[PDB]
């Protein structure tokens, strides 16, 4: 018996978790003694790409990290089983549980965001959708990244991999070299970082968001990108968050330097919040 085996007949749906474009993301329970005891899991499948999540798979199957989702298996188009975080993410989470996490539990999520994403880049992985929706909360006291499905491998010796699609990117979460050049560097997820730490400061608010931030700052859906690349030219970054201390702001901009080369690393990012929680 495989354990990483689920029969669909056994695999049995319960309700949505989650949706985008493509991907899909149902809570099911695997259930071989029928009597509804067996264990829950989250079910990532498409929608009615197939080579992608077959790649997302094989990238989620081989990464093994206190702060990465968990792997569980697959059911055969195909589908992919995880574990289940009845929580979340950050951006349906922080907005209901305000007073329990407070700026020192916030510096622990990014110093458990920056572990897990500082593991995929020693796999030479660039993950590309950084992003608060990405992180799933396991408790008060842990976050996950729980998504890969952008997730490219830079090969090796090389800086960056390049992708150019009709597929819509997060835009506001990208560094102007994703924008400008469909270029992925590991500092891009950095830069992602930086954006994320944000939102995880603002409590995921919808009106103070990335995107809602931006676009105040910029004033057409295709003349957009054009602006949000100029703004950052001229130097122009997502002002600090509400009550958030100056320190944690200058490790955001850390993040947002222009060019890729001279942003800081995760781990620099991890000692400098590790300092602050002293
Ligand atoms: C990262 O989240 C997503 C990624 C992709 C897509 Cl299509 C949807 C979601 C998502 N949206 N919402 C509202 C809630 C989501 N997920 C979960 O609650 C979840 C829970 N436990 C383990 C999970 C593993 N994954 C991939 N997701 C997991």
Same mark, same amino acid.
């Given at each position: 018996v495989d354990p990483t085996h689920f029969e669909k007949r056994f695999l049995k749906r319960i309700r949505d978790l989650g949706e985008g474009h493509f991907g899909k993301v149902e809570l099911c329970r695997y259930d071989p003694?029928?009597? &509804?005891?067996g264990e829950q899991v989250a079910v990532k499948s498409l929608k009615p790409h197939i080579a992608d999540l077959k790649k997302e798979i094989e990238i989620l199957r081989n990464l093994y990290h206190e702060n990465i989702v968990k792997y569980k298996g697959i059911c055969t188009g195909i589908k992919l089983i995880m574990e289940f975080l009845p929580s979340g993410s950050l951006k349906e989470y922080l907005p209901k549980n305000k007073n329990k996490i407070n700026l020192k539990q916030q510096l622990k999520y990014a110093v458990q965001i920056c572990k897990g994403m500082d593991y995929l880049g020693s796999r030479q992985?660039?993950?590309?959708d950084l992003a608060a929706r990405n992180v799933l909360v396991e408790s008060e006291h842990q976050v996950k990244i729980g998504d890969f499905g952008l997730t490219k491998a830079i090969e090796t010796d090389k800086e960056y991999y390049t992708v150019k699609d009709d597929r819509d990117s997060p835009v506001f979460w990208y560094a102007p070299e994703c924008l400008m050049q469909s270029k992925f560097y590991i500092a891009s997820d950095v830069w992602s970082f930086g954006v994320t730490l944000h939102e995880l400061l603002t409590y995921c608010d919808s009106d103070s968001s990335p995107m809602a931030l931006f676009l105040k700052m910029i004033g057409h859906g295709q003349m957009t990108v054009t602006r949000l690349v100029n703004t950052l030219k001229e130097g122009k970054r997502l002002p600090c968050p509400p009550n958030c201390p100056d320190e944690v702001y200058q490790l955001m901009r850390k993040c947002?330097?222009?060019?890729?080369? &001279?942003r800081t690393s995760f781990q620099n990012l991890i000692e400098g919040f590790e300092a602050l929680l002293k």
């Open positions: 003694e029928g009597d &509804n005891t992985y660039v993950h590309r947002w330097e222009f060019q890729p080369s &001279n």
